[PDB]
Design an enzyme around this catalytic site. Sequence first.
Site, mmCIF file in Angstrom:
data_model
loop_
_atom_site.group_PDB
_atom_site.id
_atom_site.type_symbol
_atom_site.label_atom_id
_atom_site.label_comp_id
_atom_site.label_asym_id
_atom_site.label_seq_id
_atom_site.Cartn_x
_atom_site.Cartn_y
_atom_site.Cartn_z
ATOM 1 N N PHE A 158 0.864 -1.180 0.000
ATOM 2 C CA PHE A 158 0.000 0.000 0.000
ATOM 3 C C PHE A 158 0.899 1.228 0.000
ATOM 4 O O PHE A 158 1.829 1.310 0.810
ATOM 5 C CB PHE A 158 -0.941 0.008 1.217
ATOM 6 C CG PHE A 158 -2.094 0.989 1.101
ATOM 7 C CD1 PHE A 158 -3.127 0.767 0.203
ATOM 8 C CD2 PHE A 158 -2.152 2.114 1.909
ATOM 9 C CE1 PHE A 158 -4.185 1.658 0.100
ATOM 10 C CE2 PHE A 158 -3.213 3.012 1.812
ATOM 11 C CZ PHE A 158 -4.228 2.784 0.908
ATOM 12 N N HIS A 169 0.485 7.523 2.127
ATOM 13 C CA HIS A 169 -0.741 8.275 2.344
ATOM 14 C C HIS A 169 -0.688 8.879 3.736
ATOM 15 O O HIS A 169 0.110 8.461 4.580
ATOM 16 C CB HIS A 169 -1.967 7.366 2.253
ATOM 17 C CG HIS A 169 -1.977 6.303 3.294
ATOM 18 N ND1 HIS A 169 -1.089 5.253 3.284
ATOM 19 C CD2 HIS A 169 -2.702 6.172 4.427
ATOM 20 C CE1 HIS A 169 -1.286 4.503 4.351
ATOM 21 N NE2 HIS A 169 -2.251 5.047 5.072
ATOM 22 N N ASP A 187 -3.518 9.384 6.861
ATOM 23 C CA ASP A 187 -4.802 8.785 7.206
ATOM 24 C C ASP A 187 -5.935 9.801 7.175
ATOM 25 O O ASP A 187 -5.765 10.977 7.507
ATOM 26 C CB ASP A 187 -4.778 8.197 8.609
ATOM 27 C CG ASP A 187 -4.038 6.892 8.685
ATOM 28 O OD1 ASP A 187 -3.653 6.370 7.616
ATOM 29 O OD2 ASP A 187 -3.820 6.397 9.807
ATOM 30 N N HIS A 197 2.819 7.526 5.676
ATOM 31 C CA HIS A 197 3.285 6.184 5.954
ATOM 32 C C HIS A 197 2.835 5.269 4.824
ATOM 33 O O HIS A 197 1.992 5.627 3.989
ATOM 34 C CB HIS A 197 2.823 5.707 7.334
ATOM 35 C CG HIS A 197 1.338 5.781 7.526
ATOM 36 N ND1 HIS A 197 0.663 6.962 7.753
ATOM 37 C CD2 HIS A 197 0.400 4.809 7.505
ATOM 38 C CE1 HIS A 197 -0.633 6.710 7.856
ATOM 39 N NE2 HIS A 197 -0.821 5.413 7.694
HETATM 40 C C1 LIG Z 1 -2.077 0.056 8.103
HETATM 41 C C2 LIG Z 1 -3.581 -0.163 8.173
HETATM 42 C C3 LIG Z 1 -4.270 1.101 8.669
HETATM 43 C C4 LIG Z 1 -4.157 -0.638 6.823
HETATM 44 N N1 LIG Z 1 -4.398 0.450 5.891
HETATM 45 C C5 LIG Z 1 -5.630 0.955 5.755
HETATM 46 O O1 LIG Z 1 -6.598 0.534 6.388
HETATM 47 C C6 LIG Z 1 -5.809 2.108 4.772
HETATM 48 C C7 LIG Z 1 -4.715 3.144 4.978
HETATM 49 S S1 LIG Z 1 -4.898 4.094 6.507
HETATM 50 N N2 LIG Z 1 -7.108 2.709 5.008
HETATM 51 C C8 LIG Z 1 -8.049 2.803 4.071
HETATM 52 O O2 LIG Z 1 -7.918 2.330 2.946
HETATM 53 C C9 LIG Z 1 -9.290 3.546 4.479
HETATM 54 C C10 LIG Z 1 -10.433 2.623 4.870
HETATM 55 C C11 LIG Z 1 -11.667 3.404 5.290
HETATM 56 C C12 LIG Z 1 -12.859 2.523 5.607
HETATM 57 N N3 LIG Z 1 -13.215 1.613 4.509
HETATM 58 C C13 LIG Z 1 -14.038 3.417 5.964
HETATM 59 O O3 LIG Z 1 -15.001 3.545 5.241
HETATM 60 O O4 LIG Z 1 -13.883 4.021 7.106
HETATM 61 C C14 LIG Z 1 -3.273 -1.700 6.194
HETATM 62 O O5 LIG Z 1 -2.764 -2.564 6.877
HETATM 63 O O6 LIG Z 1 -3.144 -1.608 4.885
HETATM 64 FE FE LIG Z 2 -2.742 4.540 7.106
#
Ligand SMILES: CC(C)[C@@H](NC(=O)[C@H](CS)NC(=O)CCC[C@H](N)C(=O)O)C(=O)O
Ligand SMILES: [Fe+3]
Length: 328
Positions: free
Chosen positions: A208, A211, A213, A267
């Site tokens: 990933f 980005h 958060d 991150h």
């Molecule tokens: C590191 C973690 C936070 C995780 N990454 C993630 O969850 C990533 C980056 S913060 N987050 C997202 O894509 C947003 C999800 C939002 C969710 N569907 C909603 O509607 O609220 C990973 O392990 O990839």
């Molecule tokens: Fe994140």
Amino acid sequence: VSKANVPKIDVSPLFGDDQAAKMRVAQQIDAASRDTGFFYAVNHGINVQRLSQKTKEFHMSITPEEKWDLAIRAYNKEHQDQVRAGYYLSIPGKKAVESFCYLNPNFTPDHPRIQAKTPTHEVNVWPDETKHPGFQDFAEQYYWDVFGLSSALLKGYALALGKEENFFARHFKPDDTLASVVLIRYPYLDPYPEAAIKTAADGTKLSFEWHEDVSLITVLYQSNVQNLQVETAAGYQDIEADDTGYLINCGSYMAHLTNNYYKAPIHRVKWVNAERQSLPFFVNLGYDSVIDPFDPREPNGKSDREPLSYGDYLQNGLVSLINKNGQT
Ligand SMILES: CC(C)[C@@H](NC(=O)[C@H](CS)NC(=O)CCC[C@H](N)C(=O)O)C(=O)O
Ligand SMILES: [Fe+3]
């Protein structure tokens, strides 16, 4: 590649009534938030044991039929009301990760935000109880356990910024919070499809990309496999894993309202070929919540930034993150 300083902060005073001890926690939160932006909350009172015990399995026992039946609209056109909540399918050969997202259990057909069809509010979808006994109970219970920890953490952040302890927490309420839990499975795959691996500008293989958060804060449990990196001026630094603690960082809503004094750390997730779990709780406020910005670097504390409504912030941020980093 160097290692990030990620302090372990005993947050237990934030649940108590010893005010100077709470200030000593707040100081540690401030220091971490002004350094790399990450810390581990320890002595947090949650049973993360198993949380993990389960969660891979729920993960290890759902069938393709059930995945389609729970899928968000990105994977199932029949489910136009499921933008956020539901199952996010893997695509064998292309996309390794899969996940299940759920929102505030108090969002039911009786809730006025559901009645009004306000964006970002949805009624959770759940698998059949007999195929997944205890899953919904565990997941809803977990939502409130981590809500409670998050409330306490928000008291620490408020005190760290020179505010009264309820400055953030007063906007974080069970009846309207837009907070979400995501139960993420990262699989072991042999061969691992190169198509599910991204290459960073610096050559690092990623699952990933970079980005900030979309949250006020993020409260993360992960199994014991190192994967996260945080950007600093000297480049990316590895965040060590700790499967007994919660990894905490600020999101872009906090950066906005503090005039960037507490930045939202950039991150990314390294590619690692190992079975693991990543279980974030995104601490979001209510749809109409507005925090008045301030600048704790200025003697008079004044900021010229516009107070942002949390719901509109969330709608803009979730769409932007999909467009930049892809549909998860
Ligand atoms: C590191 C973690 C936070 C995780 N990454 C993630 O969850 C990533 C980056 S913060 N987050 C997202 O894509 C947003 C999800 C939002 C969710 N569907 C909603 O509607 O609220 C990973 O392990 O990839
Ligand atoms: Fe994140």
